[PDB]
Design a binder for this molecule. Structure first.
Ligand SMILES: [Mg+2]
Ligand SMILES: [Mg+2]
Ligand SMILES: [Mg+2]
Ligand SMILES: [Mg+2]
Ligand SMILES: [Mg+2]
Ligand SMILES: [Mg+2]
Ligand SMILES: [Mg+2]
Ligand SMILES: [Mg+2]
Ligand SMILES: [Mg+2]
Ligand SMILES: [Mg+2]
Ligand SMILES: [Mg+2]
Lengths: 48, 122, 120, 215, 114
RNA sequence: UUGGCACCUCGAUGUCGGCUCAUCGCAUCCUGGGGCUGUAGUCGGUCCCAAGGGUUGGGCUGUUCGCCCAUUAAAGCGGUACGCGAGCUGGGUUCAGAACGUCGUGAGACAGUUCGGUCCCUAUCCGUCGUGGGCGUAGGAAAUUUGAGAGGAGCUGUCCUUAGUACGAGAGGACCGGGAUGGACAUACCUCUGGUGUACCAGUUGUCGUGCCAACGGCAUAGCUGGGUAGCUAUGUGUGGACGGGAUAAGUGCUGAAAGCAUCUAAGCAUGAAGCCCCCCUCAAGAUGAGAUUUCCCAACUUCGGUUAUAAGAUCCCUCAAAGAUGAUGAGGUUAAUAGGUUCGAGGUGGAAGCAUGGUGACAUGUGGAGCUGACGAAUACUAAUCGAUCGAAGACUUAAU
């Protein structure tokens, strides 16, 4: 139930090495505008 | 499927009207029985007179389960109640007036006397 | 089929109110899973409209809510009359389709994939 | 001797001598070819390998598996063949038969051969202890809060650890398994099927390995 | 071609001799019984309770009362141990599965004609 | 085991049984093999070898225990904090209530009964059951494999023949062999039997609503009720244990001295068990010893520091399910049948609406195996799998043959 020992600063940072985030789609909209998310229709600042 | 403590109608004039199973004899751990399987059983409702009386422990063969048997040709047979014939420890019965239909699947269990004392076998 | 996070009647009531409003406005903005499932609902309901007989008029009213469209020149047709009268005349040659799903970005309160479902 | 590859079509039944109903798994063992012959002088063991279901050739912008890649073209070009989806070795066979490129057809088996059929299981996902293993569940009443848990996992402090092989929950899984001593009942040459008596592991349109019985 | 293989392989063992019936109909099933002696034929007259899923695994079920004891009997429809089926009497039912007759005994388990 | 001692723990080592899950000894309960017998046979007895596997269900008692009814080839004995409560119950007992017996003047007490009496914890680490990512495996890939190893399995009855033979005065009744089948168990699968099947079909009650009739709709556990596809499923279907090899235990020997003999042992040579090693089934090169085969790919700039790009190959993303918590796995991504839709089926329900006829009606009959149908099958590009983007090798030395 409770942790018997504290986790160190080293063990904590080894656990959250897969606690990351990915870069998204980022495809250009060839008609007009900035980068749209891939396989998505744009809403603002683009023509998809 | 006939296990311990199932009430069965008794299908002859052996002296019993209702009987409940103690064990399904056969092997060790044997849980259920069907047509052709001998069970050891105590009579609960007995006819006044006859041979067996209430509280006797008798051996008896299963005829006509409600969850009947499957045949080699993919055929099935099922009955509307579970019945039973009290036997006399040589695969021969106690009575001479076996009641109701008997399944065919106990011809090959050497219960030919039970077949000959019965109505139409199906 | 998808359960959409609701009961058998909460899903059924949600799915025919979402199919009625895609007959009224002809393009609605929903989430992605709720548009994957109302896709097969309204396309099976335009199929009843291309028939146009009385027996399938009774079947399209199993599904459609009693919503009145204010059309042009202050004339009012119901969503049952607008299904057999306008959408049924548009797709009388097409053998399927009748909708499309255009994906959009996540919402702000959720990561819910926004989707426009249109009526083609 | 006598290995072949197929896939599960489904399950039916057949009547036989004196009208006996026998259950039947139809296996479409179609378009198997001998694709590489292996020798002890090169590899250390004698086997052939059979490629089962041919797929489409090399395409430049191919994004899925039904178009072969360039190693699978050149491997199935050293035999005059089309590239196959499934490739399995058979080492119970005699290597001195089976020239490389032979269409090993469905009439290598006769009605009455005993065989082994190898396939994966279905795969049930993450399952618990009384489903993944045949464990007795706890009582559902009489105050109890133990129903479908595993029981104790060890002894107290002699063995202050859990022994491995504990039979805990996890993935029930599609893993390979053989059913042995099945019969071939009917070989339809024109449909290229085998009717094997009983049931074989795997889902429909899976992959079987019908080879003769080692027992 | 997946879809023909269930059909085209088991096709030559399906039958054509059998009449047309449905649940509610009274049948005379001429099943043949082979012991070690001969090839005797016994008739089973009953009322069709059930007809289920198609193919060569078409399966019907008739119901008889023998000695005060009702008897269910279930056959593969295409088995080669049914020599003959006679439709004795038709029946006016409104179900496909007549399982309510299992709790009805005597004149209450009566099924009309045509 | 009952104790003895008081060493660990009283700033807690928390509970007797039972349940779930076991695991280990062998001083062996059954099955295997032997010796001896006051072993005719059938049965036994006793001792030795052996842990492979198996070792029931009830009645009474809170009971451990014990008795008893049934069985069974047998219903082994022990150890694991009298195994296991951060896995479960709480009947037993050290709680407050109350009562009897008994004791006490009494308050009370008994270790005598009797009725009643709150079972906390979101798992940090180790350990286990699954599953990914990273890197390594001296080029990079795709695919098939070797098996060092590890794991699983391993039980047994009954019957028939041999043969009423051997044996026996008789009664009885064999070994060895052969064959058939089971029980228990373990697996795979949904064809059958069934179960479920909350987007399938039908019936029906109440009430509200769609103006009304008729048709429907909402709610009433899915309102109930009758069924039921796909899928999941057992109680349903299939298989499995086997053989067979080596080496041995107890044992049985052959030859054979030492010790002219004798002697199973000393040198030799055999034989010998459910045991041991294979055989059988899985999993396995992170097997850092990183294996092997087949196929594919081959760069220049350039203090080659590195960059720029890329090959084969992948991946992002998108359509999905034979896969799945996730992600992995698999089917696909326009040269496309991946999913939906459409069309046609299969199976299911059991005769739609509307109309007509008949009936005073409630309702019947016809139109018509009718309508409807979620997951199943086929066809069809109608809709959506867009455009894109990212990653990815250049083959080190040393010596030896060539
Ligand atoms: Mg970090
Ligand atoms: Mg509701
Ligand atoms: Mg239990
Ligand atoms: Mg504990
Ligand atoms: Mg001291
Ligand atoms: Mg010993
Ligand atoms: Mg603890
Ligand atoms: Mg008190
Ligand atoms: Mg006193
Ligand atoms: Mg109380
Ligand atoms: Mg309301």
């Amino acid at each position: 139930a409770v942790p018997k020992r504290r986790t160190s600063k080293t063990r904590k940072n080894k656990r959250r090495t897969h606690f990351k985030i990915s870069v998204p789609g980022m495809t250009e909209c060839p008609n007009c505008g900035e980068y749209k998310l891939s396989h998505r229709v744009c809403k603002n600042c683009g023509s998809y | 499927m006939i296990q311990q403590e199932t009430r069965l109608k008794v299908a002859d004039n052996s002296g019993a009207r209702e009987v409940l199973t103690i064990k399904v004899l056969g092997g060790s751990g044997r849980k259920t029985a069907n047509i052709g399987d001998v069970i050891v059983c105590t009579v609960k409702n007995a006819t006044p007179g006859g041979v067996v009386k209430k509280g006797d422990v008798v051996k008896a063969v299963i005829v006509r389960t409600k969850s009947g048997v499957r045949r080699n040709d993919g055929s099935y047979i099922k009955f509307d109640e579970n019945a039973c014939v009290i036997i006399r420890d040589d695969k021969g019965p106690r009575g001479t007036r076996i009641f109701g239909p008997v399944a065919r699947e106990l011809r090959e269990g050497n219960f030919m006397k039970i077949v000959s004392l019965a109505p139409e076998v199906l | 089929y998808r359960k959409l996070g609701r009961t058998s009647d909460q899903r059924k009531a949600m799915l025919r109110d979402l199919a009625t409003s895609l007959i009224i406005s002809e393009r609605i903005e929903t989430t992605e899973a709720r548009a994957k499932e109302v896709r097969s609902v309204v396309e099976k309901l335009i199929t009843l409209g291309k028939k146009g007989d009385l027996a399938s008029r009774r079947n399209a009213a199993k599904t459609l809510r009693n919503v009145e469209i204010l059309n042009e020149d202050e004339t009012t047709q119901t969503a049952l009359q607008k299904l057999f009268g306008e959408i049924a005349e548009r797709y009388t040659e097409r053998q399927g389709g009748y909708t499309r799903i255009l994906k959009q970005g996540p919402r702000r309160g959720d990561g819910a994939e926004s989707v426009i479902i249109e009526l083609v | 001797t006598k290995g072949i590859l197929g896939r599960k079509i489904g399950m039916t039944q057949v009547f036989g001598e004196n009208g006996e109903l026998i259950p039947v798994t139809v296996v479409e063992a179609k378009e198997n070819v001998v694709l590489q012959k292996k020798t002890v002088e090169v590899d250390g063991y004698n086997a052939i390998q059979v490629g089962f279901e041919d797929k489409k050739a090399y395409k430049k912008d191919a994004k899925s598996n039904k178009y072969a890649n360039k190693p699978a073209e050149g491997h199935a070009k050293k035999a005059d063949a089309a590239p196959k989806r499934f490739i399995r070795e058979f080492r119970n066979v005699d290597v001195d038969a089976y020239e490389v490129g032979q269409e090993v057809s469905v009439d290598t088996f006769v009605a009455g051969d005993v065989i082994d059929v190898t396939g994966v299981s279905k795969g049930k996902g993450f399952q618990g202890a009384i489903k993944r293993h045949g464990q007795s569940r706890g009582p559902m009443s009489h105050g109890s809060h133990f129903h479908r848990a595993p029981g104790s996992v060890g002894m107290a402090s002699d063995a202050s650890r859990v022994f491995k092989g504990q039979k805990m929950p996890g993935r029930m899984g599609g893993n390979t398994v053989t059913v042995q001593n099945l019969e071939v009942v009917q070989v339809d040459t024109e449909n290229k099927v085998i009717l094997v008596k009983g049931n074989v592991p795997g889902p429909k349109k899976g992959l079987v390995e019908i080879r003769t019985s080692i027992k | 071609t997946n879809h023909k293989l269930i059909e085209a392989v088991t096709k030559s063992q399906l039958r054509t001799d059998l009449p047309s019936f449905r649940p509610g109909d009274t049948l005379r099933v001429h099943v043949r019984i082979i012991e070690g002696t001969r090839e005797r034929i016994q008739v089973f007259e009953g009322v069709v309770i059930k007809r289920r899923g198609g193919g060569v695994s078409e399966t019907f079920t008739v119901r008889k009362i023998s000695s005060g004891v009702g008897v269910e009997r279930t056959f593969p429809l295409h088995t080669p141990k049914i020599e003959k089926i006679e439709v004795k009497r038709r029946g006016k039912v409104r179900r496909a599965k007549l399982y309510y007759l299992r709790s009805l005994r005597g004149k209450a388990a009566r099924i009309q004609e045509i």
